[PDB]
């Protein structure tokens, strides 16, 4: 599923990401845009054999189990396939754990490079939440 900008903003708000750990809603929408281009089915391989999954490109090295990343962890205690659903529940729940792991939203490299410090509110502007 390829979410629309406002469609995702509304869903993320309902899933409690607005101001989560001090990060306004726009940060999360912006992160999804540059990580997955709003595609819930996005999968991208990393050089270490791990893979990034879903709307927020959560990796199998530490967060989910995809059964093909030896010596990795599954801190979110979920199959990586759960992060590829049209329903963002699993991705949001895992993202909430990630953002509290010590580096805030810096865990998302695309957010760090394209969103951090910018007018992220523009990503939810004009949207019905």
């Amino acid at each position: 599923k390829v979410f629309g900008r406002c469609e995702l903003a509304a869903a993320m708000k309902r899933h409690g990401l607005d101001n989560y750990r001090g990060y306004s809603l726009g940060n999360w929408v912006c992160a999804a845009k540059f990580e997955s281009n709003f595609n819930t089915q996005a999968t991208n391989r990393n050089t270490d054999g791990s893979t990034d999954y879903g709307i927020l490109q959560i990796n199998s090295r530490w967060w989910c189990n995809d059964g093909r990343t030896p010596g990795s962890r599954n801190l979110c205690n979920i199959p990586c396939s759960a992060l590829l659903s049209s329903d963002i529940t699993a991705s949001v729940n895992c993202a909430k754990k990630i953002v509290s792991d010590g580096n805030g939203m810096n865990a998302w490299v695309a957010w760090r490079n394209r969103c951090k410090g910018t007018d992220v509110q523009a990503w939810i502007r004009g949207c019905r939440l």
Partner: nanobody
Framework: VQLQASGGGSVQAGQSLRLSCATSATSSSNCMGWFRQAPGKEREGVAVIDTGRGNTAYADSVQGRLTISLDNNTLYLQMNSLKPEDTAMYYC?????????????????????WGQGTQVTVS
């Protein structure tokens, strides 16, 4: 001449091209790669390499045809069996070592550095 891409050209499908870029790579970056862009379109990740380990990753669209390598200080992109869909501007990119990265990915948004691009046209 830093991160300046070259090697592009206009060729028939099936032929090959070898893109290159100068670096200065294992000290200032964790990851280096190549991304491409068509007029009015978004950047598309093509290949990436871990500057320290040498491990690589590719986009599904170029898997088995393109090869990224680092001759620590030149970055190469061997393009074999070119397809019409490969037509676009190619750029070489790098990230910053000021941030830890235990692995690398092709997402263009994972790289804050890049230089001049080179055109690849395949008919």
């Amino acid at each position: 001449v830093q991160l300046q891409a070259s090697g592009g050209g206009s060729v028939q499908a099936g032929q090959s091209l070898r893109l290159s870029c100068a670096t200065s790579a294992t000290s200032s970056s964790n990851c280096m790669g190549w991304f491409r862009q068509a007029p009015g379109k978004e950047r598309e990740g093509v290949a990436v390499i871990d500057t320290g380990r040498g491990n690589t990753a590719y986009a599904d669209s170029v898997q088995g045809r393109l090869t990224i390598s680092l001759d620590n200080n030149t970055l190469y992109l061997q393009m074999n069996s070119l397809k019409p869909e490969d037509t676009a501007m190619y750029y070489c990119a790098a990230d910053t070592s000021t941030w830890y990265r235990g692995y690398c990915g092709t997402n263009p948004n994972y790289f804050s550095y890049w230089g001049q691009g080179t055109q690849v046209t395949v008919s």
